[PDB]
Structure 1
Amino acid sequence: LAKRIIAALIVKDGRVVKGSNFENLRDSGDPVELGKFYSEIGIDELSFWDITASVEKRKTMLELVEKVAEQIDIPFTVGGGIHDFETASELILRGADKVEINTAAVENPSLITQIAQTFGSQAVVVYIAAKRVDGEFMVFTYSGKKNTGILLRDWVVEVEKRGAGEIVLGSIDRLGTKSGYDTEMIRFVRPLTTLPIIAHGGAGKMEHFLEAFLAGADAAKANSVLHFREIDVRELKEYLKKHGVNVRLEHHH
């Protein structure tokens, strides 16, 4: 239960969408070189979310995990339109440690069980995008476009029951705002599940990570605050360790 800092990269056609400000890199838009650099400066895990056009997407995501696996040694997750078991299977076999699923899991919760029955619960990360509606936390699918009418409280319990290994708790209310993590939502979800909770949405400064870990998150997912170097990963882990947060600062056949 060392808290984990996870760098999330949005990719498309093998490119980091909107790149990064790491001028030391030969290609600041290369997801492989950027992920490698993050792994060398103390990021605990990587997460790739692909938005490639559907006709090149399958081959594009497979090339990605193959190139990432050969270069990095820390765990990484791949996600973005993973709709069924066979797609998840080929991605894990080709190099990914874990797959991240949202819409397809909501529409068919047995998909969680199906992947976990071959690859283990530890390979199945369920992203839950939630938002306050009429005083209740609701589950949203299709990139935030559809209110499922399903309560966050009910979906969290079902997700663990179906055999998921971890939950990314994404607050639509906070996505892109730099205003902080939705600690009220994290605190709401924490007593409902024994699974690791990965906070996503709202990161803006180092103090937001402290607040998220106080609220009960086991990991924090960060995107542009890292790529645009508004927060430094090394400074962040120094800060969290300084204030009591257990973070890490240091082959089968």
Structure 2
Amino acid sequence: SLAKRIIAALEVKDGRVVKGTNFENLRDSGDPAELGKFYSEIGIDELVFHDHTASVEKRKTMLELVEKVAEQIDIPFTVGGGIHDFETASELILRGADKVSINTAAVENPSLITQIAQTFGSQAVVVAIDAKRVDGEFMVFTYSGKKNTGILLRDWVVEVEKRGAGEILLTSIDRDGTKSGYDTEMIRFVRPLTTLPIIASGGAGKMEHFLEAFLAGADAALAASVFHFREIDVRELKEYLKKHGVNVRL
């Protein structure tokens, strides 16, 4: 069966992890680079950083983050949060990120996907798609879930692959922040529409949710607070998944 990845998401601001972690062993539980290194050592496959720094310092702050993280880890990492053009994405990849996440800017200018891919390869471009049910249809939302674009998820997935994206980070707004489970109906809906790797995001609460997401056709599963606050142990999770037939890296 197909190889599956466990991904930790770190929300960051001003070079700090927002709300930190429960990991007492670390010198500084809010240092993104230290936390990243720790996650790679306990068995996380990749990292996603999402930045919320204020506009005047944002560009420099995200570049510093990327350089510091790149020195501490050899596993892939993605950076995102307000990447609106090619030059911003380029500077971040050159400074050390393996991949960039784009969402609002991709919907507003789908050629941005192609532009980044032309220089850095499709594998450098993660399109984050936030979606929610509206009147029985899956719709795409932008601006941190504030705007219903009126674009069907079905149509956007196909366009994203056509434009040259390498991966889709699929967040169910219906589940994000809850610990109720991944939106497996949404994952199953997207799976036949694309050949791209799908990162399931939103709703992780317990180890069984990961199994469910992988059965639904996710290639990777992303989570944040379940790991940060140690509700789920990463090694225990991989051992659980392997036991039940999922091809994870031990």
TM-score range with shorter-chain normalisation?
over 0.9
- Secondary structure of the structure 2 residue equivalent to 1:61: helix
Deviation at 1:190, TM superposition (A): 0.2
Deviation at 1:202, TM superposition (A): 0.1
Deviation at 1:42, TM superposition (A): 0.4
- Secondary structure of the structure 2 residue equivalent to 1:77: strand
The aligned counterpart of 2:168 is 167
The aligned counterpart of 1:27 is 28
- Secondary structure of the structure 2 residue equivalent to 1:91: helix
Paired with 1:119 and 1:8, the residues of 2 have a C-alpha distance of 22
Q: Could you list the per-position Cα deviations for residues 114-147 of structure 1 after superposition, in whole angstroms to 9, with x for gaps in the alignment?
A: 0000000000000000000000000000000000
Paired with 1:76 and 1:147, the residues of 2 have a C-alpha distance of 29
- Secondary structure of the structure 2 residue equivalent to 1:3: strand
Q: Name the Cα RMSD after superposition.
A: 0.4
Deviation at 1:2, TM superposition (A): 1.2
Paired with 1:170 and 1:210, the residues of 2 have a C-alpha distance of 17
Structure 1: which 4+ aligned runs deviate by more than 3 Å? none
Paired with 1:222 and 1:45, the residues of 2 have a C-alpha distance of 11
Paired with 1:214 and 1:75, the residues of 2 have a C-alpha distance of 24
Q: Could you list the per-position Cα deviations for residues 84-131 of structure 1 after superposition, in whole angstroms to 9, with x for gaps in the alignment?
A: 000000000000000000000000000000000000000000000000
Structure 1: which 5+ runs fail to align? none
Give aligned pairs, total: 249
Identity %: 94
- Secondary structure of the structure 1 residue equivalent to 2:21: coil
The aligned counterpart of 1:67 is 68
Alignment of 1:31-50 (within 5 A): 31-50=32-51
- Secondary structure of the structure 1 residue equivalent to 2:196: coil
Deviation at 1:191, TM superposition (A): 0.1
Paired with 1:176 and 1:71, the residues of 2 have a C-alpha distance of 29
Paired with 1:30 and 1:93, the residues of 2 have a C-alpha distance of 22
Structure 2: which 5+ runs fail to align? none
